Amino acid sequence: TSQVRQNYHQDSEAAINRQINLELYASYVYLSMSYYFDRDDVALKNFAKYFLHQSHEEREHAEKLMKLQNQRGGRIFLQDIKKPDCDDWESGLNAMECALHLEKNVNQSLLELHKLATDKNDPHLCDFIETHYLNEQVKAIKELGDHVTNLRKMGAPESGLAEYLFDKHTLG
Amino acid sequence: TSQVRQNYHQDSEAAINRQINLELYASYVYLSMSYYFDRDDVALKNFAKYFLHQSHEEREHAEKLMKLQNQRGGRIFLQDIKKPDCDDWESGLNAMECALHLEKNVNQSLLELHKLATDKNDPHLCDFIETHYLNEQVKAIKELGDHVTNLRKMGAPESGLAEYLFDKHTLG
Amino acid sequence: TSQVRQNYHQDSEAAINRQINLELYASYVYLSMSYYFDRDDVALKNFAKYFLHQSHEEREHAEKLMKLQNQRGGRIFLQDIKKPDCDDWESGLNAMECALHLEKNVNQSLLELHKLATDKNDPHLCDFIETHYLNEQVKAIKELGDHVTNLRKMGAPESGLAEYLFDKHTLG
Amino acid sequence: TSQVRQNYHQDSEAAINRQINLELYASYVYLSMSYYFDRDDVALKNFAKYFLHQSHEEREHAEKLMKLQNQRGGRIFLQDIKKPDCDDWESGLNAMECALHLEKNVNQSLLELHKLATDKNDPHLCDFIETHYLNEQVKAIKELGDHVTNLRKMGAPESGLAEYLFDKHTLG
Amino acid sequence: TSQVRQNYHQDSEAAINRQINLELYASYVYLSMSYYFDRDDVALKNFAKYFLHQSHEEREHAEKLMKLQNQRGGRIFLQDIKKPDCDDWESGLNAMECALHLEKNVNQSLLELHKLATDKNDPHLCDFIETHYLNEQVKAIKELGDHVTNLRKMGAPESGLAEYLFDKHTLG
Amino acid sequence: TSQVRQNYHQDSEAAINRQINLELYASYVYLSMSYYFDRDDVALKNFAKYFLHQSHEEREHAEKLMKLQNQRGGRIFLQDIKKPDCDDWESGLNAMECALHLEKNVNQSLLELHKLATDKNDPHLCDFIETHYLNEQVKAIKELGDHVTNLRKMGAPESGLAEYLFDKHTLG
């Protein structure tokens, strides 16, 4: 019934609201990770800075989908942001692996959303997803895979020197 | 028979020529609207400035399509630019509503053009439409819907104060 | 019935509307010419730039007459902009000759308009036509005649080298 | 068992975690409000900007309490962020009144937290709450009360002109 | 088996490796052309500069596809770069025509690659091809067609003055 | 039969063409190495940057010999650029050792070329090889030997920390 709505299916609107909830959840997971590494018994400041920056980026992604929802005449329906799976992320390597798993989950959701927008013949939504989300997801997954590989090769879970030097040289 | 033509169907060429005429028509409609608000008995200078700017933008859109037609080896066939439906646009609110209706007409034509380019397997034409036209149309429709909503809430057709203050504060 | 209208005859108003239509037609003809020289099988970029600049100038001329029509309390009545006579302008020399013919048509219409404004004793309209249109028309006709002479002396229709070097040295 | 923990009671730690959840909830409520006013049928851009700025401020407040929790050797335990009470905030005045109610809820929670820290003889926590939260809350409550008063005096729920001019002059 | 691979079919990976080989081949063809025009018995310095610039561009295109292959978790498999078809390119016009034929070959390969990525439902690969390759190919084909048209109209193969002046004025 | 050719034997011309092919091959080997270290399961960015820089340098060396071939009136005859020996370079140390072996191969070819130019009494070709290639080769071999020594002393193939810190401190 919106005066600006055109070629915007209800299923696309619902999937955009689900993706908003997902992006907000990812922001909250990265916030949890960031303040894990700020703990006195962990104390990796550049890990904390990295994951805080990621949480702010995911908040920006969610706000951009909300802006899209209003642009197409859809209506934003927000849900509870579930707490993350862990309070103790146990190491820098484990947190990078969980971040990698999370970003691949987000990517898969975006590919489902693009498939839906293609099936409903919504070229503006397809192009929005392609230009603003898919390449950013691919780049994030590649960066996290690079970090996981470098931590593993340096012997990260056993050797705290590996996590320390990675914090200094890569994330610093 | 053009030496540069590749993967460019005749139906796509004809639809691009129709879209060129459509964009030129929209430019002429906005020119009419702009000099309606320049009338002494109407006298809304920022409405006039807004619609003149829109007229020039639509001319740029048409020239971009013509450029595309030459880039793909198609041949531009121009038609008469029909005169707009009204000479008297009757109010700022009415003109914004007519502009909204016009932009949704333009958007529907572009979505038909994208569906045609998808059916003819022309990825360059699809990406051209997505990157240069679709988002711009969505943004224009959202802006015009915002203006119509603000004018209606201010009591625009009865109260000339509403049109005056909208001219000053939003369009100024 | 306009509160601003003074010494402005109805025949002058109708002739101004006809001149607006004619300036818009000239702008559309120059747009056609400009994208003719942008074609891959023609490819004279500075001819295209020259005629695009002329189309924008003619649009400015039309908008200035519309501004005059509102200044004097007349009412703008727009008509269809007819398509130009040709889609294929066949050469740079032929397009310059057609442009020359067009500008002399525009000039003759303006001289008819000045004769009408003189007969109706409208000194403001006479001075408007003299200051903004007549000297610009004679300068345009002189420039186009210069271009036609230079192309003909260079052997333009047979020798493509003439059109090429004119594109580079005069229009570039 | 933290090596940094000194004079930091478990009840204070639990109340800090509750306050973190409450600040995150407030950020999510303001995000909801901000994109309500971004809707095409509402379209108050400066209301949207104001509430988005408030959401970012509440996120900063939550991150500062998380930083405090790590500074004192407490452990952050995050909970679900509940969805806000409304999706449709119905007007600028209603949203300001709900924001006022929310900020007074946040202030009451902070006063309970200060009473707890006073009863547990934790001067650092008391001073943290006083310097970073209490003045900011009373300034926020005073500003929102000012906005509510100005909207009501302008006749906000009936007259959309009041909301429009408040959006322009106070929030703009 | 790559930790970053998601929605990336093996056939897409193989087609990306074929496209890498083809871009490297095109770079080598343009290198051959560039040093043809550097010969003492040909001596067209701006033709040489133009084709050397094209060879460096094609090298950049190949490196960007290799980057893409690593980003998606595919594995680069390089092949022999075949020698170009000619050592003697015989004229500036013939070299421009061969360059045009080459770019249309590259464009057809990219359209096959986009059709494959569309059939395998890989939106990131489709968007990568659209944003980085298709419009660049269309622009290159249009530019080369323009050059071929201008050389032919100037009488290029018989008249060396045509090639000389084109070298100076268009490519210089 | 070239008007420029003087004191330039056919055997020297053939050996210059062989050296061009060898420099292009070396550029392609370094390109392969560079995008090996860009892989997600390798992820040594400064190794990738180093070998990409080397590939561009070898391309410059090849273009300089092509320029020499045209300067002396010889004629460039290009051959296929063979694919490198490996797709998987297995470690930073192994890639540095292969690069060292490659540069010593290139150096031996250049010494054969200088011996040929000395035997044919071509002082310009001898001086060209001495000034532009021989000192650059011995500097490259010395640098690669330094890198291999430093990697071996740090325990490179077993310890990934060695490769990581070398990537950061020496190549970064």
Side-chain angles (χ1 to χ4, degrees), chain A residues 1-58 61-81 83-114 116-118 120-135 137-138 140-157 159-172, chain B residues 1-58 61-81 83-114 116-118 120-135 137-138 140-157 159-172, chain C residues 1-58 61-81 83-114 116-118 120-135 137-138 140-157 159-172, chain D residues 1-58 61-81 83-114 116-118 120-135 137-138 140-157 159-172, chain E residues 1-58 61-81 83-114 116-118 120-135 137-138 140-157 159-172, chain F residues 1-58 61-81 83-114 116-118 120-135 137-138 140-157 159-172:
Chain A
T1 62
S2 176
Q3 60 181 352
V4 307
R5 183 192 287 264
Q6 190 177 11
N7 197 16
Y8 191 64
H9 199 275
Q10 295 292 319
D11 296 334
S12 297
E13 183 178 2
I16 291 295
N17 286 324
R18 292 195 298 273
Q19 191 67 37
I20 290 166
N21 196 7
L22 224 195
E23 298 290 328
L24 292 167
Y25 173 74
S27 181
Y28 193 42
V29 171
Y30 286 124
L31 182 61
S32 315
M33 290 182 182
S34 178
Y35 283 91
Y36 173 73
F37 293 101
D38 175 62
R39 285 172 54 178
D40 55 356
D41 57 354
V42 178
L44 281 312
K45 188 173 181 180
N46 290 317
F47 275 92
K49 182 181 288 186
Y50 180 79
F51 289 119
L52 186 63
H53 188 267
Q54 298 300 317
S55 64
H56 293 170
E57 283 186 347
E58 299 294 325
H61 295 172
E63 293 176 357
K64 290 173 185 177
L65 284 111
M66 295 176 76
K67 192 252 189 68
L68 185 273
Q69 188 75 268
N70 287 327
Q71 282 180 308
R72 297 296 303 274
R75 293 291 176 260
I76 300 164
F77 289 99
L78 295 173
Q79 300 302 117
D80 297 336
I81 303 169
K83 66 177 289 293
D85 200 2
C86 299
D87 290 322
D88 186 352
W89 297 100
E90 296 180 355
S91 68
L93 178 59
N94 193 9
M96 288 294 175
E97 290 177 354
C98 291
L100 179 60
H101 183 79
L102 181 64
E103 290 290 323
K104 294 181 79 172
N105 190 8
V106 177
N107 199 45
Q108 181 59 43
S109 179
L110 288 168
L111 293 170
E112 294 293 330
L113 178 55
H114 189 279
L116 180 60
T118 301
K120 300 297 182 184
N121 294 317
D122 192 349
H124 174 264
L125 182 55
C126 291
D127 183 72
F128 184 80
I129 296 160
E130 291 169 358
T131 56
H132 297 289
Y133 288 90
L134 256 48
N135 195 9
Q137 283 303 110
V138 163
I141 293 168
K142 177 65 166 63
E143 184 185 0
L144 288 170
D146 292 336
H147 299 318
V148 170
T149 297
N150 279 308
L151 268 321
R152 286 179 181 172
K153 286 189 174 183
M154 285 187 281
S159 63
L161 183 59
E163 295 289 344
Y164 180 81
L165 293 174
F166 186 83
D167 185 85
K168 180 69 173 179
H169 297 299
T170 297
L171 300 181
Chain B
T1 62
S2 176
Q3 60 181 352
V4 307
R5 194 182 192 125
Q6 190 177 11
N7 192 37
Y8 191 64
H9 199 275
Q10 295 292 319
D11 296 334
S12 297
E13 183 178 2
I16 291 295
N17 286 324
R18 292 195 298 273
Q19 191 67 37
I20 290 166
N21 190 82
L22 186 41
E23 298 290 328
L24 292 167
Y25 173 74
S27 181
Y28 193 42
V29 171
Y30 286 124
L31 182 61
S32 175
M33 290 182 182
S34 178
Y35 283 91
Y36 173 73
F37 292 101
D38 186 70
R39 285 172 54 178
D40 76 83
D41 57 354
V42 178
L44 290 178
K45 188 173 181 180
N46 290 317
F47 275 92
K49 182 181 288 186
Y50 180 79
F51 289 119
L52 186 63
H53 188 267
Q54 298 300 317
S55 178
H56 293 170
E57 283 186 347
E58 299 294 325
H61 295 172
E63 293 176 357
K64 186 182 292 80
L65 281 175
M66 295 176 76
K67 181 179 175 57
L68 185 273
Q69 188 75 268
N70 287 327
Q71 277 179 339
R72 297 296 303 274
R75 293 291 176 260
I76 300 164
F77 289 99
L78 295 173
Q79 300 302 117
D80 297 336
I81 303 169
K83 72 168 129 43
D85 200 2
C86 299
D87 290 322
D88 186 352
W89 297 100
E90 296 180 355
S91 68
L93 178 59
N94 185 64
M96 288 294 175
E97 290 177 354
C98 291
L100 179 60
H101 183 79
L102 181 64
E103 290 290 323
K104 294 181 79 173
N105 190 8
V106 177
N107 196 15
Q108 181 59 43
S109 179
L110 288 168
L111 293 170
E112 294 293 330
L113 178 55
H114 189 279
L116 180 59
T118 301
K120 300 297 182 184
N121 294 317
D122 192 349
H124 174 264
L125 182 55
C126 291
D127 183 72
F128 184 80
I129 296 160
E130 291 169 358
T131 304
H132 297 289
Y133 288 90
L134 298 195
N135 194 223
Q137 283 303 110
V138 163
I141 293 168
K142 177 65 166 63
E143 184 185 0
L144 288 170
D146 292 336
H147 299 318
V148 170
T149 297
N150 279 308
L151 283 164
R152 286 179 181 172
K153 286 189 174 183
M154 299 164 75
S159 63
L161 186 39
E163 306 229 314
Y164 180 81
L165 293 174
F166 186 83
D167 185 85
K168 180 69 173 179
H169 297 299
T170 297
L171 300 181
Chain C
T1 62
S2 176
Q3 60 181 352
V4 172
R5 183 192 287 264
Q6 190 177 11
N7 197 16
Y8 191 64
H9 199 275
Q10 295 292 319
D11 296 334
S12 297
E13 183 178 2
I16 291 295
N17 286 324
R18 292 195 298 273
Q19 191 67 37
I20 290 166
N21 196 7
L22 186 268
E23 298 290 328
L24 292 167
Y25 173 74
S27 181
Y28 193 42
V29 171
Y30 286 124
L31 182 61
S32 315
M33 290 182 182
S34 178
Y35 283 91
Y36 173 73
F37 292 101
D38 186 70
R39 285 172 54 178
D40 55 356
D41 57 354
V42 178
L44 281 312
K45 188 173 181 180
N46 290 317
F47 275 92
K49 182 181 288 186
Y50 180 79
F51 289 119
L52 186 63
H53 188 267
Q54 298 300 317
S55 64
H56 293 170
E57 283 186 347
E58 299 294 325
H61 295 172
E63 293 176 357
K64 290 173 185 177
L65 284 111
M66 295 176 76
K67 192 252 189 68
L68 185 273
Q69 188 75 268
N70 287 327
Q71 277 179 339
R72 297 296 303 274
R75 293 291 176 260
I76 300 164
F77 289 99
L78 295 173
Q79 306 297 146
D80 297 336
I81 303 169
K83 66 177 289 293
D85 200 2
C86 299
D87 290 322
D88 186 352
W89 297 100
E90 296 180 355
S91 68
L93 178 59
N94 193 9
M96 288 294 175
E97 290 177 354
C98 291
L100 179 60
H101 183 79
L102 181 64
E103 290 290 323
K104 294 181 79 173
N105 190 8
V106 177
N107 196 15
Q108 181 59 43
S109 179
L110 288 168
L111 293 170
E112 294 293 330
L113 178 55
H114 189 279
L116 180 59
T118 301
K120 300 297 182 184
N121 294 317
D122 192 349
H124 174 264
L125 182 55
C126 291
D127 183 72
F128 184 80
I129 296 160
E130 291 169 358
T131 56
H132 297 289
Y133 288 90
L134 256 48
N135 195 9
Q137 283 303 110
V138 302
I141 293 168
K142 177 65 166 63
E143 184 185 0
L144 288 170
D146 292 336
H147 299 318
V148 170
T149 297
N150 279 308
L151 268 321
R152 286 179 181 172
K153 286 189 174 183
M154 295 167 70
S159 63
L161 183 59
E163 295 289 344
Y164 180 81
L165 293 174
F166 186 83
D167 185 85
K168 180 69 173 179
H169 297 299
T170 297
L171 300 181
Chain D
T1 62
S2 176
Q3 60 181 352
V4 172
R5 183 192 287 264
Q6 190 177 11
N7 197 16
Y8 191 64
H9 199 275
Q10 295 292 319
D11 296 334
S12 297
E13 183 178 2
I16 291 295
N17 286 324
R18 292 195 298 273
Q19 191 67 37
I20 290 166
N21 196 7
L22 186 268
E23 298 290 328
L24 292 167
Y25 173 74
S27 181
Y28 193 42
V29 171
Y30 286 124
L31 182 61
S32 315
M33 290 182 182
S34 178
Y35 283 91
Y36 173 73
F37 292 101
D38 186 70
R39 285 172 54 178
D40 55 356
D41 57 354
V42 178
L44 281 312
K45 188 173 181 180
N46 290 317
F47 275 92
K49 182 181 288 186
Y50 180 79
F51 289 119
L52 186 63
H53 188 267
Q54 298 300 317
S55 64
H56 293 170
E57 283 186 347
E58 299 294 324
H61 295 172
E63 293 176 357
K64 290 173 185 177
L65 284 111
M66 295 176 76
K67 192 252 189 68
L68 185 273
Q69 188 75 268
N70 287 327
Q71 277 179 339
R72 297 295 303 274
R75 293 291 176 260
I76 300 164
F77 289 99
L78 295 173
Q79 300 302 117
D80 297 336
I81 303 169
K83 66 177 289 293
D85 200 2
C86 299
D87 290 322
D88 186 352
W89 297 100
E90 296 180 355
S91 68
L93 178 59
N94 185 64
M96 288 294 175
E97 290 177 354
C98 291
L100 179 60
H101 183 79
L102 181 64
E103 290 290 323
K104 294 181 79 173
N105 190 8
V106 177
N107 196 15
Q108 181 59 43
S109 179
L110 288 168
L111 293 170
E112 294 293 330
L113 178 55
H114 189 279
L116 180 59
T118 301
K120 300 297 182 184
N121 294 317
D122 192 349
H124 174 264
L125 182 55
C126 291
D127 183 72
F128 184 80
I129 296 160
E130 291 169 358
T131 56
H132 297 289
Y133 288 90
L134 256 48
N135 193 223
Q137 283 303 110
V138 302
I141 293 168
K142 177 65 166 63
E143 184 185 0
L144 288 170
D146 292 336
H147 299 318
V148 170
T149 297
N150 279 308
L151 268 321
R152 286 179 181 172
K153 286 189 174 183
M154 295 167 69
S159 63
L161 183 59
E163 295 289 344
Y164 180 81
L165 293 174
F166 186 83
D167 185 85
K168 180 69 173 179
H169 297 299
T170 297
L171 300 181
Chain E
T1 62
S2 176
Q3 60 181 352
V4 307
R5 194 182 192 125
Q6 190 177 11
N7 197 16
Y8 191 64
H9 199 275
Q10 50 169 226
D11 296 334
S12 297
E13 183 178 2
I16 291 295
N17 286 324
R18 292 195 298 273
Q19 191 67 37
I20 290 166
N21 196 7
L22 186 268
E23 298 290 328
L24 292 167
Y25 173 74
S27 181
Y28 193 42
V29 171
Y30 286 124
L31 182 61
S32 315
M33 290 182 182
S34 178
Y35 283 91
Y36 173 73
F37 292 101
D38 186 70
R39 285 172 54 178
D40 55 356
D41 57 354
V42 178
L44 290 178
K45 188 173 181 180
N46 290 317
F47 275 92
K49 182 181 288 186
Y50 180 79
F51 289 119
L52 186 63
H53 188 267
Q54 298 300 317
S55 64
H56 293 170
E57 283 186 347
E58 299 294 325
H61 295 172
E63 293 176 357
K64 290 173 185 177
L65 284 111
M66 295 176 76
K67 182 179 175 55
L68 185 273
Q69 188 75 268
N70 287 327
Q71 277 179 339
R72 297 295 303 274
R75 293 291 176 260
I76 300 164
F77 289 99
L78 295 173
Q79 300 302 117
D80 297 336
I81 303 169
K83 66 177 289 293
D85 200 2
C86 299
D87 290 322
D88 186 352
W89 297 100
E90 296 180 355
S91 68
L93 178 59
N94 193 9
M96 288 294 175
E97 290 177 354
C98 291
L100 179 60
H101 183 79
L102 181 64
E103 290 290 323
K104 294 181 79 173
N105 190 8
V106 177
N107 196 15
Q108 181 59 43
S109 179
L110 288 168
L111 293 170
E112 294 293 330
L113 178 55
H114 189 279
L116 180 59
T118 301
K120 300 297 182 184
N121 294 317
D122 192 349
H124 174 264
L125 182 55
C126 291
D127 183 72
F128 184 80
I129 296 160
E130 291 169 358
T131 56
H132 297 289
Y133 288 90
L134 256 48
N135 195 9
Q137 283 303 110
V138 163
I141 293 168
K142 177 65 166 63
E143 184 185 0
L144 288 170
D146 292 336
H147 299 318
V148 170
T149 297
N150 279 308
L151 268 321
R152 286 179 181 172
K153 286 189 174 183
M154 299 165 74
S159 63
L161 183 59
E163 295 289 344
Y164 180 81
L165 293 174
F166 186 83
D167 185 85
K168 180 69 173 179
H169 297 299
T170 297
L171 300 181
Chain F
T1 62
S2 176
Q3 60 181 352
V4 172
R5 183 192 287 264
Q6 190 177 11
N7 197 16
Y8 191 64
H9 199 275
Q10 295 292 319
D11 296 334
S12 297
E13 183 178 2
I16 291 295
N17 286 324
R18 292 195 298 273
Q19 191 67 37
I20 290 166
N21 196 7
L22 186 268
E23 298 290 328
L24 292 167
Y25 173 74
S27 181
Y28 193 42
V29 171
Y30 286 124
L31 182 61
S32 315
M33 290 182 182
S34 178
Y35 283 91
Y36 173 73
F37 293 101
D38 186 70
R39 285 172 54 178
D40 55 356
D41 57 354
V42 178
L44 281 312
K45 188 173 181 180
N46 290 317
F47 275 92
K49 182 181 288 186
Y50 180 79
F51 289 119
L52 186 63
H53 188 267
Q54 298 300 317
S55 64
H56 293 170
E57 283 186 347
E58 299 294 325
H61 295 172
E63 293 176 357
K64 290 173 185 177
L65 284 111
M66 295 176 76
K67 192 252 189 68
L68 185 273
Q69 188 75 268
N70 287 327
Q71 277 179 339
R72 297 296 303 274
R75 293 291 176 260
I76 300 164
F77 289 99
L78 295 173
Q79 300 302 117
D80 297 336
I81 303 169
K83 66 177 289 293
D85 200 2
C86 299
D87 290 322
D88 186 352
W89 297 100
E90 296 180 355
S91 68
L93 178 59
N94 193 9
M96 288 294 175
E97 290 177 354
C98 291
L100 179 60
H101 183 79
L102 181 64
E103 290 290 323
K104 294 181 79 172
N105 190 8
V106 177
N107 196 15
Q108 181 59 43
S109 179
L110 288 168
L111 293 170
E112 294 293 330
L113 178 55
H114 189 279
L116 180 59
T118 301
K120 300 297 182 184
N121 294 317
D122 192 349
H124 174 264
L125 182 55
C126 291
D127 183 72
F128 184 80
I129 296 160
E130 291 169 358
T131 56
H132 297 289
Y133 288 90
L134 256 48
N135 195 9
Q137 283 303 110
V138 302
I141 293 168
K142 177 65 166 63
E143 184 185 0
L144 288 170
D146 292 336
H147 299 318
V148 170
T149 297
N150 279 308
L151 268 321
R152 286 179 181 172
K153 286 189 174 183
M154 285 187 281
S159 63
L161 183 59
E163 295 289 344
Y164 180 81
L165 293 174
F166 186 83
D167 174 280
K168 180 69 173 179
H169 297 299
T170 297
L171 300 181

